[PDB]
Design a protein around this ligand. Structure first.
Ligand SMILES: *Cc1c(COP(=O)(O)O)cnc(C)c1O
Ligand SMILES: *Cc1c(COP(=O)(O)O)cnc(C)c1O
Lengths: 399, 399
């Protein structure tokens, strides 16, 4: 009998997560990792937050069971999630229009949404930005959903091409999903203004789209509440929406797989009925979600003192990234770049969408041991005072 | 615009995990939880193992990052998993024929395996025993695979009907998946003997089946090595197989979501090609797996002294369950059951597949606050010296 695996086609390594192994294997002295979006401190450590360590110490001392969570996870984690997303005292919360499942990361939340929609609704098409995080298409395609692209970035002026965005969504139909990044658009770092979010919310209602927000960076653009303004503008008028949120970056809990899928419907009866099918989709995937990271988040968000410690740590990360963004632009100039990189200062979040080409990114790896994503996305949150001059010399060398 | 969620049909609660909510809500102080397969201690707590607490205390004091694991998880976890499954020094390991991905539980490993097969092979169907764990059908169907049943249990005589099993599997075609429970068949507790496993392995090779092992209870039948004899009989002569294993029960790590998907192929080239697509399927599901529980497992298994503490705790659980199984049969007779319940002694694992009908299980809940699964499956590992008399009085009253 011919093996079942004989006809398999190899898949390439992931263009983002595969960079870790490539970086590790490189033997060039002075290599620099700017790939996966993870926060580094000034010393080059990707740290555990102090608030997280304190929560983990509390759990070690107080947990007396590991019994399965419910399919939707820890109830306090869901309550705190809805407050972060919508605001305490939101009508969505008071009217019991939203239900939240704790999931294994924001990716898990996107997947649970995809499987839920594919099995239980008439959704067949999801619109994502050009460019976007590459795993969006993979997640929705896994469920058999068609993924189209809408225009988003003006690569010439390094701004949002809002007129092309509007034009390109003209053919998005009622009952199609349109996916928006809540803040810190990945990879461009360019987000709608509040006025643009309000225009998009109105258009979405008029055209009957189902909005899906990917919210992986709440707190990294301007602050927790400011970064939710776009989502909240959508929440103010829509009957239905979905939010896939992540605590990987804003709590530094990447490998503990901490996210949430929040389903909003017109009323409590409808959301509860829909959520019962979301739970069935979870049960048939990974059964129930991992407790450790979500329990850390719930422990921090439900305790005023620990929460204040965490929100200061998040503000401190944002401040350091902003300082690196400015130092990067200045050092590129110092080291002889003639391209104007001032547009990088306007980008929000952890990255610089640099305009470097695929060929330049590959040269930076092969000739200089500097690792970025082939889309030109560079992790500013991985830069330090000690690595800045060599990384900028390398970039100037490939321009 | 009519809402996308307006016409969704509600899903029922899960027949196993839904018992957690029903039990927790019941106000009667005498309620007894015999539902989900979790181990209780004599004080009535579902505990954290001492080895696990020790490992968690080490992780708390020594972890310096939460950076993403690889898509396939912690390397030492995969090594230790292959050794448990196949034996240190197995030819499968020496010949580099096996690749392991850490997953969010055994369920996550089943779904990853099913998505991998549906999307990269000609597999269309999985053969599952009658009866089996109810979530098997849901996992496989959610990945797009048809599920067919093969004969297994003789419910009137409470035994494995091996001739009926082999006869029904003649309908399985080359390139179909056949699911086997590695040990502690859920729900019946009846496993093939070693000779029967060897017979099944030879037939599977001759017929071209792709074996998938669900191995959630290694250590709960007879012991770690003995419980893997059936899997190892398959590993001796198969070109290809898949193992979905779980550490939820044998480490008591239920809510940390700790399992593995292991692929075996004819040679290193083939298994590495296949595994590249398994990684792609993971990436598009939950991205990468949760570190905390798997870190605990790797810490325990890779330290000789801590491993010995854990293996004694696992033996102590298995022995207490055996004592409860023997006490349950006697107590049923003292409480007035006339019928033969000796078949319960022959069952391996956490459960007793009791022969109670759906109506009897519902009466147990409603009238006595005793919670079992509607199939008649009862969690012997939830029995204690203190709850045995009331649970047996309730059972006799509904017979
Ligand atoms: C970080 C990221 C994610 C996924 O996050 P996880 O929590 O690691 O699964 C999802 N979407 C975007 C846009 C991201 O940047
Ligand atoms: C325990 C169980 C599972 C699920 O295990 P998790 O690790 O919690 O996902 C899978 N299969 C069987 C047969 C089980 O009993």
């Amino acid at each position: 009998h011919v093996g079942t695996f004989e006809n398999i086609t190899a898949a390439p390594a992931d263009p983002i997560l595969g960079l870790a192994d490539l970086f590790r294997a490189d033997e060039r002295p002075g290599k620099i990792n700017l790939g996966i979006g993870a926060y580094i401190d000034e010393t080059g450590k990707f740290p555990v937050l102090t608030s997280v360590k304190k929560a983990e110490q509390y759990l070690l001392e107080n947990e007396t069971t590991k019994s399965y969570l419910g399919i939707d996870g820890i109830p306090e984690f869901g309550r705190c999630t809805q407050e972060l997303l919508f605001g305490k005292g939101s009508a969505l919360i008071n009217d019991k229009r939203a239900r939240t499942a704790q999931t294994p990361g924001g990716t898990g939340a996107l997947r649970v949404a995809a499987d839920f929609l594919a099995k239980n609704t008439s959704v067949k098409r999801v619109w994502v930005s050009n460019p976007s995080w590459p795993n969006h298409k993979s997640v929705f395609n896994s469920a058999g959903l068609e993924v189209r692209e809408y225009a988003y970035y003006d690569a010439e002026n390094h701004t949002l091409d809002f007129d092309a965005l509007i034009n390109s969504l003209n053919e998005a139909q009622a009952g199609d999903v349109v996916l928006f990044h809540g803040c810190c658009h990945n990879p461009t770092g360019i987000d709608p203004t509040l006025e643009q979010w309000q225009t998009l919310a109105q258009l979405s209602v008029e055209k009957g789209w189902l909005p899906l927000f990917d919210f992986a960076y709440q707190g990294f653009a301007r602050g927790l509440e400011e970064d939710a303004e776009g989502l909240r503008a959508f929440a103010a008028m829509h009957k239905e929406l979905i939010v896939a949120s992540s605590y990987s970056k804003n709590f530094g809990l990447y490998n503990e797989r901490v996210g949430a899928c929040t389903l909003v419907a017109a009323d409590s009866e409808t959301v509860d009925r829909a959520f019962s099918q979301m739970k069935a989709a979870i049960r048939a995937n990974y059964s129930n979600p991992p407790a450790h990271g979500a329990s850390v988040v719930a422990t921090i968000l439900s305790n005023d003192a620990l929460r204040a410690i965490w929100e200061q740590e998040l503000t401190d990360m944002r401040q350091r990234i902003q300082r690196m963004r400015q130092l990067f632009v200045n050092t590129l100039q110092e080291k002889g770049a003639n391209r104007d990189f001032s547009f990088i200062i306007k980008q929000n979040g952890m990255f610089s969408f640099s305009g470097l080409t695929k060929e330049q990114v590959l040269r930076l790896r092969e000739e200089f041991g500097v690792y970025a994503v082939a889309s030109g996305r560079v992790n500013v949150a991985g830069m330090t005072p000690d690595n800045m001059a060599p990384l900028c010399e390398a970039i100037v060398a490939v321009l």
